Structure 1
Amino acid sequence: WSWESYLEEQKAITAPVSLFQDSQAVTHNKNGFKLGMKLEGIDPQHPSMYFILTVAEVCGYRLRLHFDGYSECHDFWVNANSPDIHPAGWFEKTGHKLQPPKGYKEEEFSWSQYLRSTRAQAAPKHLFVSQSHSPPPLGFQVGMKLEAVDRMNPSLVCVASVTDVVDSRFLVHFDNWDDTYDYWCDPSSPYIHPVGWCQKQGKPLTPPQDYPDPDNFCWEKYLEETGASAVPTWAFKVRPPHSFLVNMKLEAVDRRNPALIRVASVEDVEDHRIKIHFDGWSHGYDFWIDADHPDIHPAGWCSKTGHPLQPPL
């Protein structure tokens, strides 16, 4: 419809652009991804692993990615400035494992041969914001240890490690567990803390799964034992609480069908999270989201990038 008219009739305001990260707000970059182009990226459900991906669909500044060789039911949407995709050849050049297309073996796969065989184009390098050409985030090296909140069970703070570093971000892994609970973040993430934070703050520390003598867990001896060093305390940066207020309006991807982006409202707030409500729909669809999540955007984002906006119901 139009935002201008909607804000008059609702007597409301939009969340100002300044409240968002530059990456959530930027509309002036062209989407250079094209149908059929090949690339590499993380599997969202297994964020430690990399796969060969094909551009299946483009919609404004977003794209839908397909896992080569696998079912179309695993297809997923990202923004064109996603740091979780990389150009062909990136795995080899940066020390990452490639999970190759269904039916191949890790070391049977060659990009050269694959491209000859498919007659496909690799998405050009200059499309990617993340190619490991930038010096890492300060003080977070692979193997280093920290304390991390299980985002799936937020009443737990757990023994964790850095297991991956790519440009300004790093992968938080929970020791002796699956990669299923892992997540990417930066040094200002409010979900991570230095070694010794639990004991100093009062809350208990969940030790690694199947660890000998769980209640008797000592950090300094775990470190010596695993030949690891703790991430240094000066590395953990303060991210201030966001400044979103209740009733501010914005645009948000619908989690029930991620092809769609809707008119939305801030229903509630925490220090680092906002509760999204889709205007005109039931509150039952309301969901909590991190303020720096890639799938929320300032009013106007859709119109300026060429993606349809679902009006309110």
Structure 2
Amino acid sequence: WSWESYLEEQKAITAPVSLFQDSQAVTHNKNGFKLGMKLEGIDPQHPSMYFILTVAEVCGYRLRLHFDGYSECHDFWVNANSPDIHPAGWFEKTGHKLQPPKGYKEEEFSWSQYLRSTRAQAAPKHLFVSQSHSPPPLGFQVGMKLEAVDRMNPSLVCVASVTDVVDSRFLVHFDNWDDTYDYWCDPSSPYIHPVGWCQKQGKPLTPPQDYPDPDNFCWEKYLEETGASAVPTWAFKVRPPHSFLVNMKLEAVDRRNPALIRVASVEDVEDHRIKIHFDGWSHGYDFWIDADHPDIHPAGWCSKTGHPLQPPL
């Protein structure tokens, strides 16, 4: 199988490298992660929470992470340039809570002790793109409030708060809802708006879960009661729409079997998202994904990084 022969055969064009973020395209960085290394990272399902993680597998510029003490059914894959992982020690130096290995107490866990117990090595610091050392996102402080789209229920724009800040990004949290709805963004995210945006746009605003008087939610009173400030309007930036076009081909990780990356096509577009189709598979497996998502890549990425590529059905 080759991309060159397949494109000639299909009279098709790949999405150029120029349409991707540098982080999605870069193939010349080596993967320094090695089996058994220990580190810290967010649970992709609960992006506000941090766990002790171990490198269980490496494949090209990707690695599979295992939650120490928990079942292997929870293992997940990230790129070696992921900002959602951090070196041993990072949580304690930056004000983040550790969920310790199964059966430990928070107060009970110490990296020194754990590494002695396991005789394991911590992943070296120099591997990690994110250590909370770079300038923060301008204008977004922890504790400030804003209006945000519930990416799980995208018809809802909701009262939300900044609850975390790491390097150039911040975490959006939906007031008094499960942290499973939280997501990381930057100032240009198309999913966030200043306080007052819904009322100015004539959209209903979804109030906090279990808000005492759900009927008459008022931002001014809520901000006062909560000792909170709005993110100032100047901080919000326009992200330009992406330049991907329908029928362009690319490589995308399989959501159902994330170990796998497949030949894919752009099936549809929005301003900030693309709809992925896996060539040769049912359109029933098609899915929408943000254009900046870390698991889409230009054609060639797998061969240049050493990751196997699944040809079309």
**Shorter-chain TM-score: which interval?**
over 0.9
Could you give the per-residue CA deviations for residues 248-279 of structure 1, whole angstroms, max 9, x where no partner exists? Answer: 00000011100000000000001111000011
Q: Cα deviation per residue 1:133-187 (whole Å; 9 max; x = unaligned)?
A: 1011011110000000001111100000000000011110000111011111111
TM-score w.r.t. structure 1 length? 0.99
C-alpha separation in 1, matches of 2:284 and 2:99: 38
CA distance, structure 2, for counterparts of residue 147 and residue 96 of structure 1: 24
Q: C-alpha deviations, 1:286-312, integer Å up to 9, x for none?
A: 111111111000000000100000011
Cα distance in 2 for residues equivalent to 1:85 and 1:114: 18
Instruction: After TM superposition, list the pairs within 5 Å mapping 1:96-111 onto structure 2.
Output: 96-111=96-111
Matches of 1:240 and 1:226 in 2, distance apart? 34
What is the DSSP-based 3-state SS (H/G/I as helix, E as strand, rest coil) of the residue aligned with 2:140?
Answer: coil
How far apart in 1 are the matches of 2:112 and 2:212? 48
Report the counterpart of residue 62 of structure 2 in structure 1: 62
Residue by residue over 1:53-78, the C-alpha shift from the partner in whole angstroms, topping out at 9 and shown as x without a partner, is 00000000000000001111000000
TM-superposed CA distance for 1:215, in Å, is 2.1
Aligned residues: 313
Deviations 1:10-57 (A, max 9, x none): 111000011011111110100000000000000111111100000000
Counterparts of 1:303 and 1:60, CA distance in 2: 9
Q: Using the alignment, how far apart are the partners of 1:207 and 1:264 within structure 2?
A: 39
> Scaled by the length of structure 2, what TM-score is found?
0.99
2:149, 2:121 → 1: CA distance?
A: 41
- Secondary structure at the residue paired with 2:33? coil
Q: Give the match's secondary structure for 1:108.
A: coil
- d(CA) in 1 for partners of 2:71 and 2:278? 31
CA distance in structure 1 between the partners assigned to 2:22 and 2:82 by the alignment: 13
Query: Could you list the per-position Cα deviations for residues 183-226 of structure 1 after superposition, in whole angstroms to 9, with x for gaps in the alignment?
Result: 11111110000000000011011111111221211111111111
SS of 1:172's equivalent?
strand
CA distance in 2, matches of 1:176, 1:115: 36
Q: Distance in 1 between matches of 2:209 and 2:263?
A: 42
Offset, 1:4: 1.0
Determine the C-alpha separation between the residues in 2 that align with 1:90 and 1:268.
40
How far is the alpha carbon of 1:5 from its aligned partner?
Answer: 1.1
1:43-192 equivalences under 5 Å are: 43-192=43-192
Secondary structure at the residue paired with 1:9?
A: helix
Structure 2 residue matching 1:106: 3-state secondary structure = coil
**Cα distance in 2 between the residues matched to 1:35 and 1:230:** 44
Q: Secondary structure at the match of 1:63?
A: strand
Map residues 239-278 of structure 1 onto 2, 5 A cutoff. Answer: 239-278=239-278
CA distance in 1, matches of 2:8, 2:239: 34
Identity %: 100
Q: Secondary structure at the match of 1:212?
A: coil
Distance 1:311 1:244 in 2: 21
SS in 2 for 1:154: coil
Runs of 5+ in structure 1 lacking a partner? none
Q: Which ranges of 4 or more aligned residues in structure 1 deviate by more than 2 Å?
A: none
User: Can you give the 5+ residue segments of structure 2 that lack an aligned partner in the other structure?
Assistant: none
Q: How many angstroms apart in 1 are the aligned matches of 2:7 and 2:226?
A: 57
CA RMSD of aligned residues (A): 0.6
Deviations 1:58-105, CA, capped at 9 Å, x for gaps: 000000000001111000000011100000000000000000101110
Rounded to whole Å, the distance in 2 between the matches of 1:121 and 1:304 is 29
Separation of aligned partners in 2, 1:287 and 1:304: 25
